[PDB]
Design a protein around this ligand. Sequence first.
Ligand SMILES: C[C@H]1O[C@H](O[C@H]2[C@H](O)[C@@H](O)[C@@H](O)O[C@@H]2CO)[C@H](O)[C@@H](O)[C@@H]1N[C@H]1C=C(CO)[C@@H](O[C@H]2O[C@H](CO)[C@@H](O[C@H]3O[C@H](CO)[C@@H](O)[C@H](O)[C@H]3O)[C@H](O)[C@H]2O)[C@H](O)[C@H]1O
Ligand SMILES: *[C@@H]1O[C@H](CO)[C@@H](O)[C@H](O)[C@H]1NC(C)=O
Ligand SMILES: [Ca+2]
Length: 496
Amino acid sequence: QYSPNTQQGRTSIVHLFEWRWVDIALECERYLAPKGFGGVQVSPPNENVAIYNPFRPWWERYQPVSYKLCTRSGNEDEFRNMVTRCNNVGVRIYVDAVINHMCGNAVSAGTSSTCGSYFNPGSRDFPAVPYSGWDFNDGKCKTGSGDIENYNDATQVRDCRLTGLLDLALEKDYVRSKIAEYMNHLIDIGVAGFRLDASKHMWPGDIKAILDKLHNLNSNWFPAGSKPFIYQEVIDLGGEPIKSSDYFGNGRVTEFKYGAKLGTVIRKWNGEKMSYLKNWGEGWGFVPSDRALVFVDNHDNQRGHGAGGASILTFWDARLYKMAVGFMLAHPYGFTRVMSSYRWPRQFQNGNDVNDWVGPPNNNGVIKEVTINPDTTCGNDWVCEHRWRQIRNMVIFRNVVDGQPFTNWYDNGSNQVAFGRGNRGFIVFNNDDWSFSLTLQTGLPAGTYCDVISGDKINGNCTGIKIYVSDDGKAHFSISNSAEDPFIAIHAESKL
Ligand SMILES: C[C@H]1O[C@H](O[C@H]2[C@H](O)[C@@H](O)[C@@H](O)O[C@@H]2CO)[C@H](O)[C@@H](O)[C@@H]1N[C@H]1C=C(CO)[C@@H](O[C@H]2O[C@H](CO)[C@@H](O[C@H]3O[C@H](CO)[C@@H](O)[C@H](O)[C@H]3O)[C@H](O)[C@H]2O)[C@H](O)[C@H]1O
Ligand SMILES: *[C@@H]1O[C@H](CO)[C@@H](O)[C@H](O)[C@H]1NC(C)=O
Ligand SMILES: [Ca+2]
C-alpha cells in the first residue's frame, strides 16, 4: 500500500479537481503520458447529493448517496473508458474514496441525487447500497448534538458525525463488505489506488479490516501481487490525541505540516527564511518520507477549508506558488502531488471568502469542457497549473533526478539557497530583496544547460536562460530579485 504503482520513471500525480472523465481520458493521451506524469487523483466517482442551495457547490461530492459510478463527471462507461485509456498510456488513476460517511442528516429526503437514486437521511435510508439505521453510529456517538464537539476526544472524533455527516458503523462486517464491494469494483476496473477521505474519523483498525477485503490490482496492467496504493487523509499538526503515525500500518498519509511550513517560510512570515530549509523533511518533525504524500495546497485549504490557514500558497499567489512547487518537486522528501484547479470569484469579506463554496466551471450545473488554448493553456476557467512551464518542467526534473541524493547545499544565511540532486540536477532560489550573482558548485558534468524555468530545450537550443558548467562543476548564476521567476533549474536532460 506504500507504492504508487506508477510505471518506472514517473514520480508525481496530479489532482484534476472536478474534471470530467472524458477530459481526463484526453489529458492522459495528449499531455500526461507525453509529459511524464505518473497518475491522477479523480474526484469522488460515486453518486452524491445534488445541492441547489448554494448552487452545486464542490463539497456536494463528499456527501455520498450510493456507490453508483454516476456523477457530474460522467457515468460508469465514461469512467471505465477513462481508466482504460489512461492505463494504456502508462498514467494511473487514483480514486477519492469517501467511505467514512454518507450525506448530511439535515438533507431532505427524495431523489435529489446525481443519479436519481432515492435517499432519506432522516430515516437513515439509502436503499441503493443498501444501508439502514443499523449501519450508522448514531447509538454509538455520545455527544449531546450527535456531531463531533471536541477533537481532544479521540473516541468522539471517530464515532460522531463530522459536521452532521451520517457516520457509518465501520466495525460491522456488513458495512465493511459494502465498501469493499465498491472498492474492488474500481480495482477490477483498473484503478491503482485510493485517497482515503477523512481517515482521521475512522479507527485505524476498521480501515485495516476493509483493506484486507481488497483484491490485488488488475493483472491485465499490473504485475501479480500488486496491492493498491493507499494514502490516508489525516490532518495532523499540533497537539491532538490522534497522530498520523497511528495509520502507518494501512499505507501512506497526508503530511499537512509540509504545505503549512513551506507557505510561511516562503512568505517569510515571523522570521522564517529559506536558509532554514537545509534540513527540510524529517528534520522538521514531519512523518517518515516513505509514509508521506506531500503537496503545497489541496482542494480544501486552497479555499480556506482546512488546516494550513493563511500561510497556504495557491495559484492565486502565482509567483511564490511556482517557487514552492519548485522546491517541493526538487526536494527528495515524500511522494508529490500537484494541484490543478479552476478559478472562482473570490469575494473576501472580513478576511473570509464568502464564495469558497462555488463549484467547477459550468452551464446550468453542467460542468464545462476543459479547452486547450494555442499556447497549451486552458480556457473555461480551468487554471491547469500542471500545464505551467515552470511546473510541468519541474515534474520532469523530479523524474530525471529520481534516486539522486541531496547535496551541494548553499545559502546566504537569508533567503537565497541552492542544492543539487546527485549529478543529475541543480536548482537555485533567490527570495531575498536583492539580486543574486554568484558562482556555485553544481556537481553536474561540464556543458551548457537550458534553464527549465525561464525556457525549454527545444531542438538543440534553449528558449530561455543558459547556464555554463565548467570542468570542476562550477557555473555562474545571476538572478535579479525582479525576475518573474526568481529561481533557476537545470538537469541532465536539459543539457545541450
Ligand atoms: C474538511 C475536513 O474537516 C476535518 O478537518 C479538521 C481537522 O481534522 C482538525 O484537526 C482541525 O484542524 O479542523 C479541521 C476542519 O474541521 C476532517 O478531519 C477532514 O478529513 C476534512 N477533509 C476531507 C473530508 C471531508 C468531509 O466529508 C471534505 O469536506 C467537505 O465536505 C463536507 C461535506 O459536504 C463539507 O461540509 C458541508 O456539508 C455539511 C453537511 O452537514 C455542512 O454542515 C457544512 O456546513 C458544509 O460546509 C465541507 O465544508 C467540505 O470541506 C474534504 O473535502 C476532505 O478533504
Ligand atoms: C540554435 O539557434 C541558432 C539561431 O538562433 C542557429 O544558428 C543554430 O544552428 C541552432 N542550433 C541548432 C542545433 O539547431
Ligand atoms: Ca466516523
